Design a protein around this ligand. Structure first.
Ligand code: PLP
Ligand code: PLP
Lengths: 393, 393
């Protein structure tokens, strides 16, 4: 194994022996490609002319009116597909073609990573198959339809609890015996090494572009960069290029759920315990066994966190807070009403925490940047249902 | 009146005397702003950092594989909001603030222009009210909800046939008496002068960026630029900067409907007759009185066409074809399956006509550019219903 599979005591490769070759071989191919500028050349061609990079940086004056905070939104919502997932997905698609693979295996919970994979595969022309828990397949008709229109095969998983965990497990069993011709496109910066690394490297351009844009527009780095954290891909992708700029804030917002003190949430980082999950060793929400997570937001509905985040958390380089279903919903409505932008419910947690920092210190002089990971069009149904059940139509 | 209100025998200002002042005053304000670079400075700041301009240019190699056609898609689908409408809307919002107006009046059929106006108004902080036929208000819950989340007031119109025509008429009656403090944000390159002009000028950057990008990437202008035509805003916006490059094709695709020979369509340009409609004099679909149009696509469901298009058509500078519900649906599915992009059903007509030009002449050496006016996420429900009714699930 070329690279180090751990970040502190976190990360690793806790996967059956049958997967070591597939994992080791992926890592090599990856290193070999990181160093090949022909690859980098293609990757950037795709990110630039297909996905639409670089993504804007927006100054939200209306939202900060009457305070001393200056707020910027890194517009990942404007990327092709609607969210930051399109970055890493185009990366691995290429990587896979490089390794001469002819197929993609992926798993999705609500279909956000599913649609992303289907799309990358359509482009790079790879036979895509996406595992999805049956319960979710029923709850997500549109995205299932999207994946099908994009020529991907959605395989409903009925074992276990017929949900994300199960779809995830089955995906890996698939790959175990098909890694010869199929690349396993993991949806986030977690899982066994080298994924946490590969995903960080394939998302790090958002942090890069941010710094550049922030200089051109403010002549100085931000006091902090805030981003929601599920498995941690969009947060690490924004963090990366700032770990070094030590006087820059690195805040990660995890879902508060129904209240970090109800069990119904997903902030294992600050309220769980280290264990091995999804092939990695990191903090997670355990019973005594693994437990359940929750959020109005499905993307943030992860019971664990990426190894590098658990690490940056223990060293104290990055801070990790929590925002709840309602504070997120509030932010979601706020951005809609003042900036004319519908944020994804996931990003709403980060925008929420920013607003919190401003409303509590209107006189404080701060330059903040929230990573708007995706657009919220795919969440109006949900928001509308809640607002209706809450009796506010 | 400063500018000339006609394009050949088309265009004009056929509106009640009460509207001449409001119309004349808009025109002036517009000219004064065209010439003010402080305005241009703001407009471009908005288009660049809020909407995400410039929009990509994508080479669709997979779609043209095995032919001599080179196809590019001007990615208007990647603009904030999902379609080219966001350009002109941000323009008029500014113009209105410039004229010291505090309110926006608009009308929408399916809510695409409604959501756009609501958004521009949220940003530039203007009190937005959008008229919408009651029938449509029922058929368009999501967009109605979007407009409401963006703080706009949707006023259902129940007179006449409770649809677009009626919502449109009521909007103008509103403006008739409120132009003092309310700007009427017309949704397309049609209507009484100066709208056809203002909308062309506020969309012309797509054609501009295209030419620039096409040079940088091909070292030569395209043989043709193809775009769907409803009222004509996205087509003119692409055409504009190419009218002069005479050896460049200017194709406009109108909806074929159920077949240009069934009456159930919307290609008044090539199959109607000149009359006065929506305050302008242009070709339209008349009974003997005005008639009905149709398309799987609501955006293309217009019984008339913009005055400049009728003009460019008579001089023969630009060609106008027709594509049907099925050819569009076919294109829609094709782009999905090979490029991993879901086109808006409207743009599908233009992509359709392009594919037609390639499949019929695989050996012909051609460089084509289709204006992908919007993303098709807001059309999967429709496509899914058709495919299901057609019994293909
Ligand atoms: C999927 C998703 C996420 C959560 O994933 P990370 O791996 O923490 O980035 C965040 N935001 C959006 C909009 C997403 O779709
Ligand atoms: C509204 C719309 C159109 C039709 O309008 P034009 O005024 O002819 O541009 C075309 N494409 C998309 C995607 C639209 O939303």
């Amino acid at each position: 194994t070329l690279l180090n599979p751990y970040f502190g005591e976190f990360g690793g490769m806790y996967v059956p022996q049958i997967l070591m070759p597939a994992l080791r071989q992926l890592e090599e191919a990856f290193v070999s490609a990181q160093k090949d500028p022909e690859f980098q050349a293609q990757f950037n061609d795709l990110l630039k002319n297909y996905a639409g990079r670089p993504t804007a940086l927006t100054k939200c004056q209306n939202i900060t009116a009457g305070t001393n905070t200056t707020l910027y939104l890194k517009r990942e919502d404007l990327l092709h597909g609607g969210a930051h997932k399109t970055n890493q997905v185009l990366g691995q698609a290429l990587l896979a073609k490089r390794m001469g693979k002819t197929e993609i295996i992926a798993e999705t919970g609500a279909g956000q990573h599913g649609v992303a994979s289907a799309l990358a595969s359509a482009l790079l022309g790879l036979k895509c198959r996406i595992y999805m828990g049956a319960k979710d397949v029923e709850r997500q008709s549109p995205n299932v339809f999207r994946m099908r229109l994009m020529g991907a095969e959605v395989i409903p998983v009925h074992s276990g609890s017929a949900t994300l965990k199960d779809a995830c497990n089955e995906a890996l069993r698939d790959w175990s015996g098909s890694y010869e011709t199929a690349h396993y496109m993991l949806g986030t910066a977690a899982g066994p090494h080298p994924y946490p690394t590969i995903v960080r490297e394939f998302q790090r351009m958002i942090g890069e572009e941010t710094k550049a844009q922030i200089l051109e527009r403010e002549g100085r780095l931000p006091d902090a960069v805030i981003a929601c954290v599920g498995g941690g891909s969009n947060a690490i992708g924004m963090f990366a290029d700032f770990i070094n700029e030590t006087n820059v804030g690195l805040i990660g917002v995890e879902p508060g759920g129904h209240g970090i003190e109800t069990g119904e949430h997903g902030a294992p980082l600050k309220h769980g315990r280290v264990g091995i999950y999804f092939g990695m060793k990191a903090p997670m929400m355990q019973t005594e066994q693994i437990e359940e997570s929750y959020s109005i937001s499905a993307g943030l509905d992860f019971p664990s966190v990426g190894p590098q985040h658990a690490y940056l958390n223990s060293t104290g380089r990055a801070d990790y807070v929590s925002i709840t279903d309602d504070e997120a919903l509030e932010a979601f409505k706020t951005l809609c009403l003042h900036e004319g932008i519908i944020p994804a419910l996931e990003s709403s947690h980060a925008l929420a925490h920013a607003l919190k920092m401003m409303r509590e210190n209107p006189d404080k002089e701060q330059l903040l940047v929230v990573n708007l990971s995706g657009r919220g069009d795919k969440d109006i149904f949900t928001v509308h249902d809640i607002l209706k059940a809450r009796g506010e139509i």
